[PDB]
Design a binder for these strands. Structure first.
Ligand code: K
Ligand code: K
Ligand code: K
Ligand code: K
Ligand code: K
Ligand code: K
Ligand code: MG
Ligand code: MG
Ligand code: MG
Ligand code: MG
Ligand code: MG
Ligand code: MG
Ligand code: MG
Ligand code: MG
Ligand code: MG
Ligand code: MG
Ligand code: MG
Ligand code: MG
Ligand code: MG
Ligand code: MG
Ligand code: MG
Ligand code: MG
Ligand code: MG
Ligand code: MG
Ligand code: MG
Ligand code: MG
Ligand code: MG
Ligand code: MG
Ligand code: MG
Ligand code: MG
Ligand code: MG
Ligand code: MG
Ligand code: MG
Ligand code: MG
Ligand code: MG
Ligand code: MG
Ligand code: MG
Ligand code: MG
Ligand code: MG
Ligand code: MG
Ligand code: MG
Ligand code: MG
Ligand code: MG
Ligand code: MG
Ligand code: MG
Ligand code: MG
Ligand code: MG
Ligand code: MG
Ligand code: MG
Ligand code: MG
Ligand code: MG
Ligand code: MG
Ligand code: MG
Ligand code: MG
Ligand code: MG
Ligand code: MG
Ligand code: MG
Ligand code: MG
Ligand code: NA
Ligand code: NA
Lengths: 102, 77, 255, 12, 88, 50
RNA sequence: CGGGGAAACCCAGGUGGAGGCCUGUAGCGAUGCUGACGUGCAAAUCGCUCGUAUGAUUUGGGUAUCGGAGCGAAAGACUCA
RNA sequence: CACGAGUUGUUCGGAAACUGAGCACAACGUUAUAUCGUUUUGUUAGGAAAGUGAAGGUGUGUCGCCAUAACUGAAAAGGGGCAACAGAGAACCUGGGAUUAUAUUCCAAAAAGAAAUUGCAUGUGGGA
RNA sequence: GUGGUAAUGCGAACACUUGCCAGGUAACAAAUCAAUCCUCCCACGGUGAGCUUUCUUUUCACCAUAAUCCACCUUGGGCCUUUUUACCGCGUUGUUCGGAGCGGGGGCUCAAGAUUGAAAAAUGCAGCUCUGUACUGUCAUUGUGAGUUCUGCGCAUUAAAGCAAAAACCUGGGGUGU
RNA sequence: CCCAACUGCAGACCGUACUCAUCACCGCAUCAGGUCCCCAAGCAUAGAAUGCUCUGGUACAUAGAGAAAGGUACACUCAGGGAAGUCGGCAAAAUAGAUGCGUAAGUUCGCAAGAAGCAUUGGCUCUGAGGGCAAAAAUUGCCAACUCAGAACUGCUUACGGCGGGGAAUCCAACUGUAUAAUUAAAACAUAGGUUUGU
C-alpha cells in the first residue's frame, strides 16, 4: 500500500503567523463587506455579554448595590459603555461620588 | 453485561446451572472473572493479585475455566 | 362550443370544498327532552379556529343526558364567549350571551345568532362572522317569531326555534384591505378552487358567451333572463336594475 | 495569542 | 431615533401597495398586534391567535372576539342590551 | 431495484431460464429444422417490463 | 439609553431582524446574439448573455377531473413528439 | 459471446397490524341494459348486517377468592374491505483472515462476541 | 401499599380493571441565539514514512472504543417551602416578567449532558521482531477555535395562512380485591 | 389461577446479485436532452460563487501528420478617429470588490440610491484598542482567539479569478406574479382595489 500523496500546510501556517502579526489584511485585501467579515450583531452580543458578566460579578462581590446594578444594567443595554474599561471607570466615578456624599 | 461486587454473589452466580464457563482475564492491574450465564455475562473484578488468585482456585470444578488470551488469525482460521 | 366554467364546477371535480383541516360541521345541541323541558349546562373547553371560516368555534362539553359519558359540541362562538364559561341551553336557560333559548323565550329587540330556521335544524341563520339577527315581534296566535335577517329581509319562524344570544365572533374581517394576490391565495386555500378569476371577455368564444372579438367587449346585454339554459346564464342573472344603485339600497333577494 | 507576536523576537 | 416619519408597521411594504390601502390596513394591523386589556386578571395581555381568537398571556384565558380588536362596538352594545333585557 | 413481488421474480426467473442456446444434438435429429433459438433476448435490446 | 418640552409631543444613539424587498449560488425558467447546429449531440439541443431565486416558490410519491369532454392567472394553451 | 457460479435475517424494508387524500364490495335505488349512482360532514343499507359477553345461577379445578364449562344477560348505534417500501409504526450492533461474487443476513462453544425482544412452559420465591 | 409540610419519593399485594368513563403519548411549527454526534483546524506528545548543496526542533500519515447496562457533577426549564413594605427588582442578542407571588436561602422534579464502572482488549490500526496467512514483544492524543438542527423548542411563524388522523400504548377516576 | 427474578424451548413468510446513468432507465442507440433522495475535505474568498489541491475516481469520447483559402470559438489584440456603421450601438467594448466622504429632480415619504461623483487599496516592521480565569482586588499572576485602527520604511509593469456602465426624457402596464412545450414574454392574463347581479 503506497502512502497518500502529500498535501502540505506549511505555507498556510507561515501565512497564518503573518496574519496573526497583522499582515495581509488591509483595505485592498478585503473582498467581502465589513459586516460579512465581522458582523456587528456578533460584536454587540460579545460586548453586552461582557458588560453583563462584569455587572453580575460586581453585584455578587458587593462592589455595587442592586440599585446601581439596575441603573448600569439598563445603561449597558442602552449602549452607554463602549467596553469593559469604560464601565469600570463609570463605576469608580459613581463610587467616589457616593463616598463624598456619605 | 452485569457487574457483581461481592464474592458471595460470584459464588451464587457460579453455582447456577446456566453458568456455561468462566473466563479469567488477567489485566496488568486486576483480574476479571467473566461468567457466561444464559443471558448475561457477570464480571467480578478483583484488584488484589493474591486474593484474585485465591478466588480463581476453589471455584466449582464442574464449570469450565477459560484463560482469556489473544488468539491470532492463524490460531483460528 | 365547450362547457362554460360555471357549469363545469357543478360536477364537483377539483372545485369541491377543501375540508381536510376543518373540524366538522358547527351545530347546536340536538334538540332533545332536556332542551325542550329544562336546560343543559355546558362548559366552554376550548375556542378554536377552523380553516376557511372567519368566525371562531367553541368546544362546549355537556354530560350525556342518558349515559355515563361526556359529549363535546362544536358551535360557532359568539363574541365574548370564553373558555370556562357556563353555557345554558334549553327552555329555562337564562337570557345571557352564549346561552341557547327558544325564540319565544327571548324578548323582542334582543340580538341573536345561530338561529334555527326550522325547529331542530341546529342553527342555519346568522352564522358568518359578525352577523346577527334582531327579534322583531312575537305572535302567539300562530306561535311564530318574526326576526330580521342579516340581509335585511324579515322572516317568520316558529317560536320553538332556538337561537344563541349575541353576535357571531370574528366581526370586522372584511374591513382590512388584502393588498396582495398572495393573501387571497392563502384565504382561498382553506375554502375551494375558485381563485384567481378570469374574465369572460378575456376568454375565447368557444368557452364563454362573452369571449371573442377584435376588442374586449360583451357584444350583447349582460343582463340575461331567469330562464336562460346553463351555459347561457352568465353575466347579470335576471337583474331587475343595473348601474350604481343611487339611493337607498333595496333589500336584495326575492319577495 | 495573549501577546501579539513580533518578527524581531523570532531571533531567540 | 425614529426610523420612519409617517408609515410605521407598514414600512415593511416598501412603496408598492398605495398610500390609502396601506393607511387603512395600518390601523387594523396595529390593533390586531397590540396587547389588549383583560377584564379577567386585570392585565394588558390579550393577544390575537388567529382571526377572532384572543388568548391572555396572564391568566391563559381564551376568548372569542373581533377580527382585529378584542371587542367590537357592536359587541358592547349587544352586551348592554342583553343585560338590560335580563333586568326587565 | 431491490423490491419485486415474488410472482414477478418468478416470471423473470423463467425468462432467464429460457434464454439459452439450442443444444447441439437437436441439430443432428432426423428432419430437424431448428438451428438457433431465434427467441434469444438481450436485456439491452428488448424489455420484458414486469 | 440619552436630549428638549408646561403639556401635547419632538429630536438623536443603539438594539431588533420585517418584506409576494434587492445583489447573487443550487433550483425553476428562457431575453438577446435573430450566435452554433440546422441530412444536428438533439423530430427543439448547445454556448454565452439573460429572468427569478422566502414565495401566488421548486420538487418526489400517491390521489381526483377527459373526448363535443376535461383542465386552463386565458395562449384555443395543455390532455403520452 | 460460451460455460460455470453467486443474493443466507427473530431484530434490516414489506406483510402480519395504523389511519390520509381517496377507492368501491355489500346494501339499496336507477337503468331496455349495471359495464350506472350513493358509499367519512361519525361513516352503508327503510335499516332486524353485534354470535361478543358485566354481573348472576349450576358444575370442575385452584385457594382460603381465582381460573374453567355450561342456562338467564348488563353493556356495546352506524356491514366488509383496500389505499403510504419517504406520514404513523418497527425488539441488533460492533469485530472478523467471513467471498471470486452476499452480508447490521455468514461466524458454533472461548459462538469474535455483547445484547434486546416476543410466545409457550418448568422449577424458585411470594399471594389466592 | 407506604414515606416527605410540600414540590413529590420508594419495587419485589404498590394484585386486577378495554365491564365503564376521563385524560395523555403517538402529534406534527418560524426566525434569533446557544448547539449534540460528528467534521475541519490549532496546541501537545508518541510511531512510521518523506525531504535533506543548504534550510526546515521540519513535511505527511495514524493515535480508534458499537449497542446494551450499573452508580450518580454541570446547563436549561417547571414547581414546592420560607422571607416576602417585593413596586422597584430579576433577566435575554432579542420584541418581558412579578401580591394571579419578583428577588434571596433551602429543596422537589424534568430534559440534555458530564463522570464511575461492566461490555473492552481478549478488539482495531501502525510499525517492529526473528524464525509463512508464522511468531514474540512496542505504540495502542487530551486539550482548544470554526462548522454542525440532535437538542433548548412550545397554546410554537407571515396569517382574512393558525400547520393530519388512527392503530397501538401510558396514566388516572370509579370499582373489584385486600 | 395471579405476580416477578430466572431458566428451557421455539422465534414463520417475501425481498436482498448488479445498476441508478457523458454506457445498465426514457428518448428507435453505449444519444452533449431528461430523471427523486442521503453522506460532502484543504486553501483563497462573503462564499455550496470561482480557481487550484489530498482521499476516492478517470485518461472513455477515432486517431496521426500538420501555419492554404473560407469557417466555428464557451479566443485575443490592434495606431488615428470614435457610431461617421446599421432599421436600430446588434455585437463588442466599458463599469466593477471593499472602505470613507457625497448624492438631484420627483415621490404614495417607504423610496429614487450602488443616483450621480471624489478619494484609498501592495509588502514589510511596529504601536494602540477590543477578553477569559484564579488569589483604590481601581491589585497581582497567568493564558486563547481573531479583528479594527494609527505610524514609519519600502514598492508597482496598476498586473489571477469573480464582480453594476451611467444620465435626461416619452408611450404602455400600478407593483411581485402567469403565459402560446417546438418562431410571439408583451402593452396580453392575473392581481390587490372598485362596482353591479341573483339568492
Ligand atoms: K365578445
Ligand atoms: K434580511
Ligand atoms: K379527467
Ligand atoms: K375515459
Ligand atoms: K417589587
Ligand atoms: K418578460
Ligand atoms: Mg443590526
Ligand atoms: Mg380577472
Ligand atoms: Mg385571447
Ligand atoms: Mg385569438
Ligand atoms: Mg357561444
Ligand atoms: Mg379593454
Ligand atoms: Mg370592455
Ligand atoms: Mg433503483
Ligand atoms: Mg434503452
Ligand atoms: Mg419492475
Ligand atoms: Mg424577492
Ligand atoms: Mg432579487
Ligand atoms: Mg439562430
Ligand atoms: Mg453546417
Ligand atoms: Mg440563476
Ligand atoms: Mg451475455
Ligand atoms: Mg448462465
Ligand atoms: Mg358501482
Ligand atoms: Mg357524500
Ligand atoms: Mg378516507
Ligand atoms: Mg343511512
Ligand atoms: Mg393497508
Ligand atoms: Mg415510514
Ligand atoms: Mg423491520
Ligand atoms: Mg457488492
Ligand atoms: Mg448469528
Ligand atoms: Mg404539540
Ligand atoms: Mg457505548
Ligand atoms: Mg428551531
Ligand atoms: Mg444483500
Ligand atoms: Mg447490495
Ligand atoms: Mg446515485
Ligand atoms: Mg461517451
Ligand atoms: Mg420505445
Ligand atoms: Mg445519456
Ligand atoms: Mg460550484
Ligand atoms: Mg467552493
Ligand atoms: Mg486525484
Ligand atoms: Mg464523438
Ligand atoms: Mg481521449
Ligand atoms: Mg482603435
Ligand atoms: Mg484600443
Ligand atoms: Mg489608442
Ligand atoms: Mg470620446
Ligand atoms: Mg447614423
Ligand atoms: Mg449610412
Ligand atoms: Mg448588447
Ligand atoms: Mg430630494
Ligand atoms: Mg432616476
Ligand atoms: Mg458607488
Ligand atoms: Mg406589467
Ligand atoms: Mg419575485
Ligand atoms: Na404528520
Ligand atoms: Na401586462
Amino acid at each position: 500500500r503506497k502512502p497518500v500523496k502529500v498535501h502540505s500546510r506549511a505555507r498556510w501556517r507561515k501565512m497564518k503567523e503573518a496574519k496573526d502579526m497583522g499582515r495581509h489584511n488591509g483595505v485592498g485585501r478585503r473582498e467581502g463587506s465589513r459586516e460579512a467579515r465581522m458582523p456587528s450583531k456578533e460584536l454587540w452580543m460579545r460586548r453586552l455579554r461582557i458588560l453583563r458578566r462584569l455587572l453580575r460579578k460586581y453585584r455578587a462581590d458587593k462592589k455595587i448595590d442592586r440599585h446601581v446594578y439596575r441603573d448600569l444594567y439598563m445603561r449597558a443595554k442602552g449602549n452607554v459603555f463602549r467596553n469593559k474599561r469604560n464601565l469600570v471607570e463609570h463605576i469608580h466615578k459613581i463610587k467616589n461620588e457616593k463616598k463624598k456624599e456619605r | 453485561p452485569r457487574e457483581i461486587k461481592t464474592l458471595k454473589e460470584f459464588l451464587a452466580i457460579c453455582s447456577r446451572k446456566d453458568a456455561r464457563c468462566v473466563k479469567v482475564k488477567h489485566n496488568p492491574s486486576a483480574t476479571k472473572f467473566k461468567v457466561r450465564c444464559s443471558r448475561y455475562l457477570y464480571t467480578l473484578v478483583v484488584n488484589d493479585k493474591k486474593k484474585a488468585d485465591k478466588i480463581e482456585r476453589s471455584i466449582h470444578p464442574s464449570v469450565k475455566k477459560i484463560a482469556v488470551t489473544a488468539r491470532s488469525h492463524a490460531k483460528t482460521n | 362550443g365547450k362547457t362554460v366554467l360555471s357549469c363545469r364546477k357543478g360536477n364537483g371535480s377539483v372545485y369541491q370544498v377543501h375540508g381536510h383541516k376543518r373540524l366538522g360541521p358547527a351545530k347546536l345541541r340536538i334538540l332533545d327532552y332536556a332542551e325542550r323541558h329544562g336546560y343543559m349546562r355546558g362548559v366552554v373547553k376550548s375556542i378554536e379556529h377552523e380553516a376557511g371560516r372567519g368566525a371562531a368555534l367553541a368546544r362546549v362539553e355537556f354530560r350525556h343526558p342518558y349515559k355515563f359519558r361526556r359529549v363535546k359540541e362544536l358551535m360557532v362562538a359568539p363574541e365574548g364567549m370564553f373558555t370556562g364559561q357556563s353555557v345554558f341551553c334549553g327552555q329555562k336557560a337564562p337570557l345571557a350571551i352564549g346561552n341557547v333559548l327558544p325564540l319565544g323565550q327571548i324578548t323582542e329587540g334582543c340580538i341573536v345568532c345561530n338561529v334555527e330556521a326550522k325547529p331542530g335544524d341546529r342553527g342555519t341563520l346568522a352564522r358568518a362572522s359578525g352577523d346577527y339577527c334582531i327579534i322583531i315581534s312575537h305572535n302567539h296566535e300562530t306561535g311564530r317569531t318574526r326576526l330580521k335577517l342579516p340581509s335585511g329581509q324579515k322572516k317568520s319562524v316558529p317560536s320553538t326555534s332556538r337561537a344563541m344570544i349575541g353576535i357571531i365572533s370574528g366581526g370586522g374581517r372584511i374591513e382590512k384591505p388584502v393588498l396582495k394576490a398572495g393573501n387571497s391565495f392563502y384565504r382561498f386555500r382553506g375554502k375551494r378552487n375558485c381563485w384567481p378569476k378570469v374574465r369572460g371577455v378575456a376568454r375565447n368564444p368557444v368557452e364563454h358567451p362573452h369571449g371573442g372579438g377584435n376588442h374586449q367587449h360583451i357584444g350583447h346585454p349582460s343582463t340575461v333572463s331567469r330562464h336562460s339554459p346553463p351555459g347561457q346564464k352568465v353575466g347579470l342573472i335576471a337583474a331587475r336594475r343595473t348601474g350604481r344603485i343611487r339611493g337607498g339600497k333595496a333589500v336584495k333577494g326575492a319577495w | 495569542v495573549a501577546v501579539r507576536a513580533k518578527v524581531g523576537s523570532r531571533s531567540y | 431615533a425614529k426610523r420612519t416619519v409617517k408609515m410605521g408597521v407598514m414600512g415593511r411594504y416598501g412603496t408598492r401597495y398605495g398610500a390609502n390601502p396601506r393607511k387603512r390596513a395600518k390601523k387594523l394591523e396595529v390593533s390586531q398586534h397590540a396587547k389588549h386589556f383583560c377584564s379577567f386578571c386585570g392585565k394588558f395581555a390579550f393577544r390575537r391567535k388567529a382571526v377572532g381568537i384572543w388568548r391572555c398571556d396572564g391568566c391563559s384565558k381564551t376568548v372569542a372576539g373581533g377580527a382585529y380588536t378584542l371587542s367590537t362596538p357592536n359587541n358592547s352594545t349587544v352586551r348592554s342590551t342583553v343585560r338590560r333585557l335580563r333586568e326587565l | 431495484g431491490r423490491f419485486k413481488p415474488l410472482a414477478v421474480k418468478k416470471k423473470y426467473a423463467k425468462k432467464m431460464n429460457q434464454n439459452k442456446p439450442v443444444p447441439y444434438w437437436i441439430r443432428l435429429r432426423t428432419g430437424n429444422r431448428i438451428k438457433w433459438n431465434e427467441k434469444r433476448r438481450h436485456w439491452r435490446r428488448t424489455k420484458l417490463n414486469y
